Amino acid sequence: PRSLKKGVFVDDHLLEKVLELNAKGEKRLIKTWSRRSTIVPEMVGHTIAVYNGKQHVPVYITENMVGHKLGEFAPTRTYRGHG
């Protein structure tokens, strides 16, 4: 994945919105367009609506889903099976 020599990647503009909610008293829904952004220990507890190209998926964030990206939890493809 991303080289350990560099930093843990969050789009900062989103990381900003997270911290502001922790201080001022959390929490509300977060419209984001950062699927490329990493889930982070501060994001835990909120619910972030992640856009998949079409809609924003209401994603609750927990402890076990820290190291992943926001995009893994917002499916991009519609599929109900074949035939």
Partner 1 sequence: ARIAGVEIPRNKRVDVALTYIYGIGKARAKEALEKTGINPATRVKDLTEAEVVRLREYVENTWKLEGELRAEVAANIKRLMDIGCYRGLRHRRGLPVRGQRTRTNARTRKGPRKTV
Partner 2 sequence: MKEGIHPKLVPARIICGCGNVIETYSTKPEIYVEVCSKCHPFYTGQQRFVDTEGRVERFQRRYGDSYRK
Binding site for RNA (CB under 7 A): 1-6, 9, 35-36, 38, 52-54, 68-69, 71-72, 74, 76-77, 79, 81-83
Q: Which stretch binds partner 1 (CB under 8 A): 2-10, 12-20, 44-52, 64-72?
A: 64-72
- Return the residue of 3, 25, 53, 63 that touches partner 2, per CB under 8 A: 63
- For 41, residues 6+ apart whose C-beta sits below 8 A from its C-beta are 66
3-state secondary structure 9-51: CCCCHHHHHHHHHHHHCCCCEEEECCCCCECCCCCCCCEEEEE
Instruction: Tell me the closest approach of the beta carbon of residue 68 to partner 1, in angstroms.
Output: 6
